[PDB]
């Protein structure tokens, strides 16, 4: 038995929709354990000036008890079944999910449906999470990678909703009310914009039955059915430089505008990103690594780490790279990095992409190692693609990628484009947008 057959022999993901518009999807295996949760199409982009970080403030109060069962009871009930309750919120996607035995699946769905709907929002509890979030802000402020990527969005999509942090302003966290929080939940956590995903030893029919019971009544108006069409976000060829020479090492992120989840070019951009790859000084491969930028990074000690990313959103994205380097190795690192970008648009060989495709194949498969990462894919695939894309289909798209295509797609999104630049720390050696801008053309 080989690879080409073990992709078609993967149990297809079942999809069914309730009256209120809520979708239910499942990947059934023979797992005694399972992961099942709800992936909501809500984030900081759906927020605005005054309710920024409300969805994050909500995320703090999701596990803090519901109407049917207060904090003490809810935590005690979830812990007792050996079940793990976890969740997150991004710029365009919120999720709450549970890891438990396959037998507790219906009880779990009830527990999930209780949080998204009948959340308590105790007036006394909110006041505690005031200081909690305000501490998580001070904590995350020392994550240089975090600060940089927030700054990147803040300037790339400057003047739009995507320029906002997921956690929100200090003033907003300070002054957000129970009314504001309850408003967010009612406005955004709605059935058609939610996906109940599950993965493990779960019968799909049993899943939609327990879902049919606890995921509730139909919306009345047409307004409550329709899914909102978000206003577009404007990219800006720009830079933001937050300088601090006392900071040990500098962080730099550079990106161009992406295509969005729908675009089939997002596959090629991932193949291209696989070519350059990533590195940090613990990569045992060293100077012999296939990645040219990594090899140059080792040979010349250019950086502590570098990564390439293709963060996609609904109607846009961020194709770029990020690296961490010493104050005097920044310019040479940026030089080589932009050089490999041009090498993508100009010189990309079939030999290079034959490797890159193999890496991306192994990557997407590694992405589905467990019940939670399968559930995460499923909850996101529906929410972004409208359907599940089997590994079999991904392979077909990827295997059709050749060097001539990588050159074209990269030349389309990278070549002679005004990039977005975020630089934090001791950043003297890297200077002038015009120099960076001129590094965008001719290899």
């Amino acid at each position: 038995a080989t690879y080409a057959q073990t992709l078609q022999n993967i149990p297809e993901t079942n999809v069914t929709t309730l009256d209120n518009g809520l979708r239910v999807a499942s990947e059934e295996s023979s797992q005694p354990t399972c992961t099942v949760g709800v992936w909501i199409g809500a984030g900081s982009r759906y927020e605005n000036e005054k309710n920024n970080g409300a969805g994050y403030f909500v995320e703090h109060l999701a596990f803090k008890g519901t109407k049917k069962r207060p904090c003490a009871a809810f935590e005690k009930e979830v812990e007792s079944m050996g079940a793990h309750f976890n969740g997150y919120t991004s710029r365009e996607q919120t999720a709450f999910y549970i890891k438990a035995l396959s037998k507790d699946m219906p009880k779990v769905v009830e527990l999930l449906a209780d949080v998204v709907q009948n959340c308590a929002l105790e007036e006394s509890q909110i006041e505690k999470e005031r200081g909690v979030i305000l501490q998580e802000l001070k904590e995350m402020d020392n994550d240089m990678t975090n600060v940089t990527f927030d700054y990147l969005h803040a300037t790339a999509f400057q003047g739009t909703a995507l320029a906002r942090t997921v956690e929100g302003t200090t003033e907003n966290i300070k002054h957000l009310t129970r009314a504001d929080l309850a408003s967010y939940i009612d406005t955004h956590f709605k059935a058609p914009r939610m996906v109940l995903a599950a993965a493990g030893g779960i019968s799909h029919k049993e899943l939609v039955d327990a879902a049919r019971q606890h995921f509730s009544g139909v919306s009345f108006t047409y307004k409550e059915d329709a899914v909102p069409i978000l206003p577009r976000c404007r990219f800006t060829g720009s830079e933001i430089r937050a300088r601090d020479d006392a900071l040990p090492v500098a962080h730099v992120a550079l990106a161009v505008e992406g295509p969005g989840w729908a675009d089939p070019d997002n596959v090629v951009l991932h193949v291209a990103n696989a070519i350059i790859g990533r590195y940090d000084r613990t990569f045992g491969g060293g100077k012999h690594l296939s990645s040219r930028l990594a090899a140059l990074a080792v040979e010349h000690k250019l950086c502590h780490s570098f990564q390439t990313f293709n963060t996609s959103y609904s109607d846009t994205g961020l194709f770029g790279f990020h690296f961490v380097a010493d104050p005097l190795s920044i310019d040479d690192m940026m030089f080589c990095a932009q050089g490999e970008w041009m090498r993508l648009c100009t010189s990309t060989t079939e030999s290079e992409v034959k490797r890159a495709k193999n890496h991306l194949r192994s990557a997407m498969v590694a992405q589905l190692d467990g019940t939670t990462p399968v559930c995460e894919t499923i909850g996101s695939h529906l929410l972004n693609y409208g359907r599940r894309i089997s590994l079999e289909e991904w392979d077909s798209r990827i295997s059709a990628v050749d060097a001539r295509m990588v050159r074209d797609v990269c030349s389309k999104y990278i070549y002679d484009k005004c990039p977005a630049l975020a630089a934090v720390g001791p950043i003297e050696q890297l200077l002038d947008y015009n120099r960076i801008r001129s590094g965008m053309y001719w290899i």
């Binding site: 501490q135 940090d280 045992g284 590694a366």
Partner: protein, 44 residues
């Protein structure tokens, strides 16, 4: 193929001050030590 990278300054060495964003880390097992050809070094 997965795992996040890191790097610190040596000679002297190289996100843990909350109750929850510092939590989840308090030694459950003992101490595993990983290192890879192309993946960031890990520790448990």
């Amino acid at each position: 193929x997965x795992x996040x990278x890191x790097x610190x300054x040596x000679x002297x060495x190289x996100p843990l001050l909350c109750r929850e964003s510092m939590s989840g880390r308090s030694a459950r097992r003992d101490l595993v030590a990983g290192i890879s050809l192309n993946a960031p070094a890990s520790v448990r």
